């Protein structure tokens, strides 16, 4: 297999500077004449837009801010200058030898000032309890960076089955993220305990931001 | 210039065969060096290469799945096809038909594999546990639970309120999807004027609106 190690995994850039994603291969992707590595952009939802093929050839319409470079094993994409609509995942792909393997991706996110999360917990609705269901949602909105940890605590204990976590992409108005964590229990179970806590651990704080309710 | 369109089945249950179809215009599968590939991107992740057929009838496969794959070309109809036999849950992906392995990507076609069947969701309200005056903020939520197939169309106050909404992604828990959205408005806003979650599930013609009301 030729294995391509893209790096870094994520890249935080300020608007207007350049960005450099490299992609390294275990063996040459060349014909000792032309080089078969290709660069993709994918904004969530879109299909992969090819940007550059055979190391350096920029596709038509692709803005010449993207430059491609390299051969045999080591390649580089430069986005210079990084405009706001360049935020995405980029993939490199060799197609020299089959199997045609792809790089794992690099996420180019905008940078901003650190922001801690506004957490909220919400008890289950009466409606859900009426059904004998019990979910406890804790939304932990608007924060930067993306790195955060969610711990649920039922009566001083870490219950961590039934937890569904989902995160948004980087908000394009304030380059923030957000996450919802949901603890699902059954009414029998939920009526058997009093404190429900979620505690969002994140760089901007020294101690777990703790948000909890009793009954 | 070239048109590559992929056609395939919507939802497939497990156990079955997936028949995909690439129809191409612009190029001939006759040309020396020519070929088509099938690539798929699993739901939320990397791109994976499936198979490749050439001009000279030669076929090349992804060494892990080759036991369940077969590409064939109808050059009289300008079609190539891929057949994956015995689909289970993990072949939920978007299949793309791709010219000589990288140069022109068609649109994709989204295959969902599931035993599950069209179940309308449940809209549950989330009004604040609240500990007021630690902001003149307030976040409210709406958890949509248990629906299939995707998608739902969620709004707030029939799309009158759009800033400071955050609609999280649908995560399929046990065959079935869940999804929440938080809306965050100032204290002057709620409860002074009402907030309503709107969910509609076109796969069931379910259209529900839940007023978020104080506890």
Swiss-Prot record, chain B:
Subcellular location: Cell membrane
Domain of life: Eukaryota
Annotated Ig-like domain residues: 121-213
Disulfide bond entries: 142-197
Record's protein name: Immunoglobulin heavy constant gamma 2A
Organism of provenance: Mus musculus
């Amino acid at each position: 297999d030729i294995v391509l190690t893209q790096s870094p995994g994520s890249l935080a850039v300020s608007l207007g500077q350049r960005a450099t994603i490299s992609c390294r291969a275990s063996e040459s992707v060349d014909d000792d004449g032309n080089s078969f590595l290709h660069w993709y952009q994918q904004k969530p939802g879109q299909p992969p837009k090819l940007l550059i093929y055979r190391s350096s050839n920029l596709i038509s319409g692709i803005p010449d801010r993207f430059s491609g470079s390299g051969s045999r094993t080591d390649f580089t994409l430069t986005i210079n200058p990084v405009e706001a609509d360049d935020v995405a995942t980029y993939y490199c792909q060799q197609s020299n030898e089959d199997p045609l393997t792809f790089g794992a991706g690099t996420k180019l996110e905008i940078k901003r000032a650190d922001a801690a999360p506004t957490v909220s917990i919400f008890p289950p609705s009466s409606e859900q309890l009426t059904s004998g269901g019990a979910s406890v949602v804790c939304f932990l909105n608007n924060f930067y960076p993306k790195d955060i940890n969610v711990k649920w605590k039922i009566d001083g204990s870490e219950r961590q089955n039934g937890v569904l976590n989902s995160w948004t992409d980087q908000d394009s108005k304030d380059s923030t993220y957000s996450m919802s964590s949901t603890l699902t229990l059954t009414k029998d179970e939920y009526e058997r305990h009093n404190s429900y806590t979620c505690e969002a651990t994140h760089k901007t704080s020294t101690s777990p931001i703790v948000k909890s309710f009793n009954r | 210039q070239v048109q590559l369109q992929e056609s395939g089945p919507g939802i497939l249950q497990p156990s079955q065969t997936l028949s995909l179809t690439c129809s191409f215009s612009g190029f001939s599968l006759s040309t020396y060096g020519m070929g088509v590939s099938w690539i798929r991107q699993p739901s939320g992740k990397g791109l994976e290469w499936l198979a490749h057929i050439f001009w000279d009838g030669d076929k090349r496969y992804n060494p892990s799945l080759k036991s369940r794959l077969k590409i064939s070309k109808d050059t009289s109809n300008n079609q190539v096809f891929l057949k994956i036999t015995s689909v289970d849950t993990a072949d939920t992906a978007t299949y793309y038909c791709v010219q000589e392995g990288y140069i022109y990507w068609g649109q994709g076609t989204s295959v969902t594999v599931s035993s599950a069947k069209t179940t309308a969701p449940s809209v549950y309200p989330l009004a604040p546990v609240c500990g007021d005056t630690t902001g003149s903020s307030v976040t409210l939520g709406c958890l949509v639970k248990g629906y299939f197939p995707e998608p739902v169309t969620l709004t707030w106050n029939s799309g009158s309120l759009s800033s400071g909404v955050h609609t999280f992604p649908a995560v399929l828990q046990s065959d079935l999807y869940t999804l929440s959205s938080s809306v965050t408005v100032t204290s002057s806003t709620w409860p002074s004027q009402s907030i309503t979650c709107n969910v509609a599930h076109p796969a069931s013609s379910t259209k529900v609106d839940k007023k978020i009301e104080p506890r």
